[PDB]
């Protein structure tokens, strides 16, 4: 028999403690009920850069609080932005999870972004052309590199059993969940952190994205610019995000006495080999890493309740996910794509998403996927809108594609 | 029973074909039969920016044969340097495998870098200070991206069953040979295509490096600066690279009708949760990947006849990598240290290095490690030396560890 989790071939693993700062808090628990009220983090962009650049784009997410409202002079120096963020989760999701002690030698951090400290080289570059290449910081490399994040939070934590940074843009934070807890069934590790940062909303990727005419510019109603799903969609909208969860294995878990907020059962990475930044429009590999999920879930399709819907708010985007979703034969699931309320955070999105999944199975609800007021002919789905949806959530699958064409779905299940 | 490679838990996986482009030449058989004759890579850096920031290294090899010399202006619109040396890897791998037809749903392509297209930032950064917004490539994500590499590989390859790009510094490329791996064993993939590319030698990584203290300065003689665990070393030396291998399950290379080079037998991931630059000096977590590798390939200690080790030629560094590989139970090993001849390359050296390991088994050889003229007293090692050591190599482990601490063990059979 093909190991499962529900046959017992893989181990049962749970996720024991979440933490998220969003445009709308930087408290988690806050951001749901956030959500279930209906609120957007979407505003009109007030950053001098948007009249200065004359840019089509007008509107976003910020964090409601800046993540270096939390940081000093030294954490300033020696890390970049995102390490920054990596810290600051880092130390709340530990702080939360009970402050455990585990054993270094079976503890994990995976975590993705997008980018990583972009902004890093720009000023290592100036540093030099003033002063020379003693200007430049020894320090460099380590804010420079793409892993920064995950180093800092695994140096942090003490994380000794591996510390790594999957990159697929738009699904790197749950690709990186997904790598924990292969990590995890696979014996390497019994407990791990895992998650996704992402830097805030920039000019240039501004420029970048709206160049491919993937961004809204419903900028005389913020708020009402992402509409995933709807007829009217115009694209995506940026908002700043950052997320990490703990999950560790069922044993170790019950062992220290923590409550599993949900479990995680599986995980199905596949690729399009379709374009550079479009998805596949047929959507059968994205399709497909949800079957993989389940294939290892120990799950049919008739399982699933909810789907957490990549849902960016492009036209081909959710064309392309809805084929997906028939092929992975889950239409008939209760559809949310939060990002019509939280925008869009490339790297860090998908942790987010998944944490905001597992928060969906724990509270048997849905909140209103924002802006749905015209179903598109095309797509078929049953998007939770309106109000938030009560009802009896077994299992969800998360999805999360990106650009070069990207499929990660995890697949978890009501503890 | 704990699964395992050698009682048939995981399933049988050899490396089917091998490219690499390195300082000594374009072809990787040319690669070691130049390493076999004792030539060195490393030569006085030709590039003016030398005397321009009268910088303190003067050393380090190009590339024998540019990249750009095998790209045309379309090429050079569309992707970062990294990604135009993934397409020419890619392109003369799959060559070489006698251009098979696989099923594009059971192929994956793993592959990682230390930096990805960061020339490409500076670029869309300068080209919007002139011309605003419209001025910025739609291209410029999919140029900008870190996972850019492993994305135009599988695109031209045609890998549906996953495109991942793991970084971390120093051992991407290994790492992403392991997850290839892993992504075979777990039932995910039959073939993978898997390595590292990794930038040319550029200003700002000599003067970060540099400052760290971590660089050869031996510019008097510029094939004797790299002398890994010789009394006498000083550090580093750069040397450019990158390297593709084709791995698959030995059922399906046997279906096809291709001779195996090697077997890869398994794989150890973990952490120092130490220094955010620096090695643990007891080299206990780095030793702890080369058993993971051993635990997952069924293998003891015993087994292993050489070491590929990562051998930076930095003081702290090879005296870590030594009390990494007494704790791994294999200081009874001929230790081989490529990086004194073709130098380090970050993101790409993992993988070259592994090439290396593959065609030590092939070739029942070492070459020697250059440089070698006075044993450390704290290092003892067997490291081969003078001229090159042909041997009864069954099995082989190649090290790989990178800045945040990170450790990449494979373990490799003769076929
Ligand atoms: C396989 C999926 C690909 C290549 C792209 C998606 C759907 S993901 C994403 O985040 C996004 C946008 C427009 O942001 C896409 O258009
Ligand atoms: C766990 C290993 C760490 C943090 C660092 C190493 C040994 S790897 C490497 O490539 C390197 C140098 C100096 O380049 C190191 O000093
Ligand atoms: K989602
Ligand atoms: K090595």
Same mark, same amino acid.
């Given at each position: ?18 933490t ?6 930087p408290?988690i628990?806050?951001?749901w009920k956030?959500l ?7 505003h009109?962009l007030?950053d ?5 650049w ?8 910020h964090?409601?609080?800046?993540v270096?409202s939390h ?10 932005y ?5 810290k ?10 009970? $402050?455990?002690?585990?054993d ?11 980018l990583?400290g972009?902004?890093?080289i720009?000023e $290592?570059?100036?540093?030099?052309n003033?002063?020379?290449?003693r ?8 804010m420079?590199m793409?892993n ?9 934590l ?8 999957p ?6 934070? $749950?690709?990186?969940?997904?790598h ?6 696979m014996?390497?590790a019994?407990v791990?952190v895992?998650?996704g ?7 240039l990727?501004?420029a970048?994205?709206?160049?491919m ?6 900028? #005389?109603?913020?708020?009402?610019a ?5 007829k009217?969609?115009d694209?995506?909208?940026?908002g ?8 560790e ?12 907020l949900?479990?995680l ?5 596949? $690729? ?8 596949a429009?047929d959507?059968?590999?994205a399709?497909?890493?949800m079957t ?7 799950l049919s399709?008739? #399982?699933?309740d ?20 028939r092929?992975a ?10 990002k ?14 998944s ?6 199975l724990?509270?048997?609800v849905?909140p209103?996927?924002?802006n ?14 309106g ?18 064409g ?10």
């Amino acid at each position: 028999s093909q190991p499962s989790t529900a046959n017992g071939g893989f181990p049962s693993v749970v996720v024991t403690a979440v933490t998220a700062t969003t445009s709308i808090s930087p408290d988690i628990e806050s951001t749901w009920k956030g959500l279930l009220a209906g609120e957007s983090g979407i505003h009109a962009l007030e950053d001098e850069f948007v009249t200065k650049w004359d840019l089509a784009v007008k509107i976003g997410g910020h964090l409601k609080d800046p993540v270096d409202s939390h940081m000093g002079r030294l954490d300033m120096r020696r890390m970049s932005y995102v390490q920054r963020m990596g810290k600051l989760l880092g130390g709340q999701l530990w702080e939360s999870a009970g $402050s455990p002690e585990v054993d270094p030698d079976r503890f994990a951090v995976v975590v993705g972004t997008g980018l990583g400290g972009a902004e890093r080289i720009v000023e $290592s570059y100036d540093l030099m052309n003033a002063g020379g290449p003693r200007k430049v910081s020894p320090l460099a490399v380590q804010m420079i590199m793409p892993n920064g994040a995950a180093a800092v939070i695994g140096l942090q934590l003490g994380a000794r059993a591996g510390v790594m940074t999957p990159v697929s843009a738009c699904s790197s934070g $749950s690709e990186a969940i997904a790598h924990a807890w292969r990590q995890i069934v696979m014996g390497d590790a019994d407990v791990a952190v895992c998650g996704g940062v992402e830097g805030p909303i920039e000019a240039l990727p501004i420029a970048a994205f709206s160049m491919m005419r993937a961004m809204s510019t419903r900028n #005389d109603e913020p708020e009402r610019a992402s509409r995933p799903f709807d007829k009217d969609r115009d694209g995506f909208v940026f908002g700043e995000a950052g997320a990490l969860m703990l999950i560790e294995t069922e044993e170790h878990a019950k062992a220290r006495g923590a409550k599993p907020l949900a479990r995680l059962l599986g995980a199905g990475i596949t $690729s399009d080999a379709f374009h550079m930044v479009a998805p596949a429009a047929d959507g059968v590999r994205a399709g497909r890493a949800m079957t993989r999920s389940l294939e290892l879930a120990g799950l049919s399709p008739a #399982d699933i309740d909810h789907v957490n819907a990549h849902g960016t708010a492009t036209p081909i985007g959710d064309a392309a996910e809805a084929n997906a979703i028939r092929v992975a034969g889950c239409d008939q699931a209760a559809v949310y794509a939060p990002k019509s309320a939280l925008g869009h955070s490339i790297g860090a999105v998908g942790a987010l998403e998944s944490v905001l999944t597992v928060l969906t199975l724990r509270d048997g609800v849905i909140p209103p996927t924002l802006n749905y007021e015209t179903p598109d002919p095309e797509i078929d789905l049953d998007v939770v809108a309106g109000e938030p949806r009560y009802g009896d959530y077994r299992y969800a699958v998360n999805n999360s594609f990106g650009f070069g064409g990207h499929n990660v779905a995890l697949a978890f299940g009501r503890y």
